[PDB]
Amino acid sequence: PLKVEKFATANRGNGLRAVTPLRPGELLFRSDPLAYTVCKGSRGVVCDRCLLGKEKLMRCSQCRVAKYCSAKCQKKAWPDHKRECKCLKSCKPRYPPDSVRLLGRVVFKLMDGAPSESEKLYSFYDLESNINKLTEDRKEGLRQLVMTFQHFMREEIQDASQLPPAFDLFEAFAKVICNSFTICNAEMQEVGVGLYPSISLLNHSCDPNCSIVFNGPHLLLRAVRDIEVGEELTICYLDMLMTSEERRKQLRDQYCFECDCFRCQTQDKDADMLTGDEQVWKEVQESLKKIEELKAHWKWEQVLAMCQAIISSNSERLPDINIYQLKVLDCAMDACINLGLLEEALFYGTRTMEPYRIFFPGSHPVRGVQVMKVGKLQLHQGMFPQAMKNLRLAFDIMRVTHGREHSLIEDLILLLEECDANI
Ligand SMILES: CCCOC(=O)N1CCN(C(=O)c2ccc3ccc(-c4ccc(C5(N)CC5)cc4)nc3c2)C[C@H]1C
Ligand SMILES: C[S@@+](CC[C@H](N)C(=O)[O-])C[C@H]1O[C@@H](n2cnc3c(N)ncnc32)[C@H](O)[C@@H]1O
Ligand SMILES: [Zn+2]
Ligand SMILES: [Zn+2]
Ligand SMILES: [Zn+2]
CATH class of the missing domain: 1.25.40.970 (Serine Threonine Protein Phosphatase 5, Tetratricopeptide repeat)
Incomplete structure (x- = not known):
């Protein structure tokens, strides 16, 4: 029984809104990707499957592009790598844009996969493409991506009937541009890009009442505020460490809207x-x-x-x-x-701590993770009372932002126990 629902907004497309009132920390939705892949920087650095770091990954002898945590993790990935493997083989040595690998995965998933749990609320088909607002410059790049995609999948994708009905690649890349999720690891470094069509219903706020966390490729959507029934759920699309002028440009360029929230109206924190x-x-x-x-x-x-x-x-x-x-x-x-x-x-x-407290108000998972890392380092050099207070602050935030369902909270529990026993 869902706490959230899809609804038509007055001026921001298709929104998420609360069916029941909500408390901070409450789990509202969770989802695996419709499709996803490793980012360009972390290729061969993280497992293609679970996105975890290891010193020595294995590799696919067919492609030699994708690499893996393990035999388990390489073989589980196989069913959605196998049409993709043929493509980057013969594209040896030219590794494609992340968005081109991602779309490839989407098309395979939509062709050969059972319908995904990721499209429960909202489908790839339904995604906003913001096309009547795209600048001529943005459109030029879009067709560059279309042709990049075409060249890239040529041995696996030849014609229109190797695609979904009336699939428009130009339209698809446009959706990708304003719906792609930067997947980050537990320590909050970007390790991938992925699509989560139900989660894409959430509109932006520069001061939101919800947050999303990544546990590998798995995403958890939690409420970080009190929410009442009918209230739209929001997430910040953007890094908290940006000025309003920086948000304005990025919201224009990537997401094609202007934001007239209170924080942008007042250049809140800019100075x-x-x-x-x-x-x-x-x-x-x-x-x-x-x-x-x-x-x-x-x-x-x-x-x-x-x-x-x-x-x-x-x-x-x-x-x-x-x-x-x-x-x-x-x-x-x-x-x-x-x-x-x-x-x-x-x-x-x-x-970083006192500035982080200022720029990450309420409960923000970037803060929670930082505070836990700080508590982690204090615990180890034997500074128990300061660490325990920090690991306790970290927990107060991460209980709201991560939760039981997120495995890092289990590690935070170990650290609290150890330091507390030390004391
Ligand atoms: C639906 C389409 C529109 O929604 C989106 O595109 N979203 C939804 C909101 N989402 C973030 O939650 C996000 C997600 C992953 C992160 C990973 C690392 C850090 C991160 C780590 C370190 C730092 C710093 N060292 C500066 C402090 C900053 C951030 N942030 C992250 C923040 C961004 C993107 C997925
Ligand atoms: C991931 S989607 C959010 C769902 C979208 N409203 C829909 O109906 O599919 C990103 C797009 O939603 C719109 N959007 C998101 N946040 C907004 C906001 N604060 N104000 C106006 N439009 C917004 C923009 O069109 C943006 O490109
Ligand atoms: Zn391969
Ligand atoms: Zn793995
Ligand atoms: Zn704003």
């Missing part, structure tokens, strides 16, 4: 997150493009080197609430942890 000297945080914003790029490929030592040159720059420095400064910190903390530099990690981590 705070651009404190410090303009020239300085623009360099750092420029540099962050490489830094975030290196991170997308898990090149951790190269990440840390760049980050230190900013955080301990001889030249002028930025306040930690500067979002681009704050972002460097996040990248540096994650780098140290995956480099085993735990003291240096905690140091960046603890600095």
Whole structure:
């Protein structure tokens, strides 16, 4: 019995709205992908199937493109890789765009799969394509993707009857553009892209009453606010660490609407997150493009080197609430942890905390995970009372954002127990 339902909104397409009133932390919907794949950066770094990291993955000897956690995980993936394998074989060496791999998976799934649980509320067919709002520049890229797709699937897809009835690839890529989910791991790094057609009913709010979490490819939708009956459910499409001007551009370019929520109307927090000297945080914003790029490929030592040159720059420095400064910190903390530099990690981590509290209000899973990592590092260097309070704050957030159904909450429980026993 669903707590949520599909409904037609006055001015934002087809919405989700609560059938029963809801409490924060309440599980509202859960779903596996209609189709999904690994992102370009994490190819060969994570298992194609469960998206988990390992030092040595196996690989498909047919393709040699997809790689795997294990025999189990390679063989379970086979039924939805097998028509895709033939395509990237003969496309050796030219790996296709993520969106092109994703659409390939959709077409296979829609041709050869039983109807998916992912289309229960809303189907791929029903997805918004925002086509009467696309700019001529966006459309040019769309047909570039169509031809990219065509070349890419040529040995598996030749004609229209190898597709769904009246399937329009140009229309499909348009849907993909404004409905794709960036799948992130437990530690909150992007490890994939996927589609979840029922979850795509949720419209954006720059201050939402719902959130979504990824547990591998599995997505859980929870309420993060009190919700009453008939109220539309919202999620933030976007990184919390953006100014309203940055949200405006991204909402225009990717999702084709203007947002006139209260936070955009008042440039809420904009001034705070651009404190410090303009020239300085623009360099750092420029540099962050490489830094975030290196991170997308898990090149951790190269990440840390760049980050230190900013955080301990001889030249002028930025306040930690500067979002681009704050972002460097996040990248540096994650780098140290995956480099085993735990003291240096905690140091960046603890600095992020008061700014994170400000920019991730209520219960946000990015915060919960950060606070747990901070508690994790304090626990280990033996700082029990501070860690236990942090692991307790982390739990207060993640109970709302992750829940029993999410496995990371089970790990957080282990950490609470151990530190509490230590005390
Ligand atoms: C329906 C189509 C429109 O909806 C969407 O496209 N959505 C739904 C909302 N969704 C997020 O919830 C999202 C999902 C996965 C994440 C993974 C990592 C981090 C993340 C990790 C670290 C940081 C920082 N180091 C800066 C703090 C920031 C974010 N965020 C993530 C946030 C984005 C996208 C899936
Ligand atoms: C993932 S979908 C949300 C479901 C969509 N309304 C539908 O009917 O299929 C993204 C699209 O919904 C619309 N949308 C989403 N959030 C919005 C908002 N806050 N205001 C106006 N339109 C919005 C935009 O057309 C956007 O491209
Ligand atoms: Zn293969
Ligand atoms: Zn796996
Ligand atoms: Zn807004």
